[PDB]
Design a protein around this ligand. Sequence first.
Ligand SMILES: NC(=O)C1=CN([C@@H]2O[C@H](COP(=O)(O)OP(=O)(O)OC[C@H]3O[C@@H](n4cnc5c(N)ncnc54)[C@H](OP(=O)(O)O)[C@@H]3O)[C@@H](O)[C@H]2O)C=CC1
Ligand SMILES: NC(=O)C1=CN([C@@H]2O[C@H](COP(=O)(O)OP(=O)(O)OC[C@H]3O[C@@H](n4cnc5c(N)ncnc54)[C@H](OP(=O)(O)O)[C@@H]3O)[C@@H](O)[C@H]2O)C=CC1
Ligand SMILES: CCCC[C@H](CC)CO
Ligand SMILES: CCCC[C@H](CC)CO
Lengths: 286, 289
Amino acid sequence: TTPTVTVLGLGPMGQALSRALLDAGHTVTVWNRTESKAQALRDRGALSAPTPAAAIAASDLALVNVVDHDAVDAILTAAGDAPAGRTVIGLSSDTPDRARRTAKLVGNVGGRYLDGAIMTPIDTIGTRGASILFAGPQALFDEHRGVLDTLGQLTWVGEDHGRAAAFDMALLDLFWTSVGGFGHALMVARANGIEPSELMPHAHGIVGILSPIFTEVAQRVEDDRHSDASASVSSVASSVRHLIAASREAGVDAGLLEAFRGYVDATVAAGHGDDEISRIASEMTT
Amino acid sequence: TTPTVTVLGLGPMGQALSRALLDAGHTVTVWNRTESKAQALRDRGALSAPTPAAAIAASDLALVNVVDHDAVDAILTAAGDAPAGRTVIGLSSDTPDRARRTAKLVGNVGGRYLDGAIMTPIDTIGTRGASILFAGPQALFDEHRGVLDTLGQLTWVGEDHGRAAAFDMALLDLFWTSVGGFGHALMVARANGIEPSELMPHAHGIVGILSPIFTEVAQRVEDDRHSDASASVSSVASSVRHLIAASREAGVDAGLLEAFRGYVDATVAAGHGDDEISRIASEMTTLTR
Ligand SMILES: NC(=O)C1=CN([C@@H]2O[C@H](COP(=O)(O)OP(=O)(O)OC[C@H]3O[C@@H](n4cnc5c(N)ncnc54)[C@H](OP(=O)(O)O)[C@@H]3O)[C@@H](O)[C@H]2O)C=CC1
Ligand SMILES: NC(=O)C1=CN([C@@H]2O[C@H](COP(=O)(O)OP(=O)(O)OC[C@H]3O[C@@H](n4cnc5c(N)ncnc54)[C@H](OP(=O)(O)O)[C@@H]3O)[C@@H](O)[C@H]2O)C=CC1
Ligand SMILES: CCCC[C@H](CC)CO
Ligand SMILES: CCCC[C@H](CC)CO
């Protein structure tokens, strides 16, 4: 009558997943390599299991939320034949080939596998603000959607077990590159007498322009249409040099902007200085 | 009564500025090094002037919107004494020390100077979605704010003529780094059979999580508070390796992520793997600790 779910991995995100499943009223079994991280959840109604095999054998569905697929696959090695007749969902960020290999590891012991990628922070889990992408057999996603729906908005992205991970590689590239730019910006600003609290209203303004700019860049890349520029490659080839000089003056490394400059300069050298900045990423090939 | 404004520089942003000032009912004079670029604005009601001196002498306020301060200073040199008794606003992105240099060039010929930085794209200009930062004498900003308010939301950031540029250097760093990430992401997604149109709903979701994350990282940096992590440095140290491997496999250079990894790895090596990702940027220093 009541669905069973196991969560293996009780770092910040695995705690968040466990609390959401417990609030939904599922029977939740938890396991972590560092055992005592389960204690806060046992106080909230979770059941612990002492080993990965015992944890997976307790439920129809096991979610594995750990640092990477070396950790996932180590947990599956320890679990042995426990996945047989059960479903494993990988929720551990790694490459598409690791998601496919882990699918194979689970199938070769008689389990079924979905791969997922959580694209939102812990505060969002258990709300309509969370976004989780899934890949693998459509029917298996449909079979477990009822339990998984309490976690957030789910999107199935394809049959290929690696496809959620492929989205994750692209989306986390955008995310972490932006985070690197933000932390750099705060360092250089602070060296110029602008504390983070004073910058932040304006930094929110920059975040506010990204969606419409990205929409246009994506459309231009699909159209292969880089003409009629509103902001040219030659203009940013001038600007990025200023930004690097400012970094240098402040004693802050400029490696992200230096990499960017290399692409911009290669676009100018290729004869596309007059084109929209949608052209620059072409020069990232090699 | 009717305000007089000159725009010097008719690239895409100078055209946008000029259209917004004309749409507001101002008396707009325009000048560009390449004179043919003035025709569409003359049809909208702009006056054109043949030289920078004649352009600046036509108006109480001159906006200079060109690629950099080497171009600004070449235009103001050509204008000679035309700025005397008038106000020049630089709207051309460059360093704080170039903004201060240009301020002194204007003051040398008896003009007044504000430096400004436009922080939004051409479509926003003339709307409440635009943002322009200004630096220089507060009273001079106040004198011209009624004309300038037709371009967008305005922020005066202080009396030092370099200070709008200092914000610009920080904010464009964030912006272009993010654009570099985005263009890279599209190329790696395409190699993996995900076209830009299929990625974009999800990319908008990532943009949607940045502001609260940035607000937290800024508070932690101010507080020097990197503990009780919800996303640890050790975790991103693993993640960024995956990202770089995926770039390699797609035939795409991973320079930006490689640079980030070096900071992440240095933070782990400093014994801060369990800390929040707010700690990473410390390792960007090139100063002796
Ligand atoms: N935190 C977040 O906001 C988000 C996280 N994610 C993803 O969720 C996953 C988990 O993230 P998060 O909770 O932050 O934690 P981490 O990525 O820091 O992973 C820590 C967890 O992995 C376990 N682990 C590490 N190595 C091994 C191993 N060899 N064997 C067994 N378990 C191991 C840890 O066990 P122990 O406690 O014993 O050290 C702990 O449970 C990651 O893949 C991350 O990318 C996705 C979106 C957001
Ligand atoms: N486009 C945008 O969305 C935004 C632009 N900005 C800033 O606004 C400024 C203008 O941007 P944008 O319109 O895109 O154009 P560009 O940065 O490409 O600059 C082009 C303008 O500069 C002029 N110019 C270049 N070199 C010289 C020179 N030596 N002497 C005289 N004029 C010269 C060009 O003249 P000519 O026509 O004869 O070549 C043209 O008018 C830049 O500093 C930019 O960073 C700010 C926010 C957004
Ligand atoms: C600092 C929070 C990071 C969450 C992010 C979600 C895409 C990466 O794991
Ligand atoms: C691609 C449009 C670029 C606008 C940007 C505004 C901060 C930089 O000039």
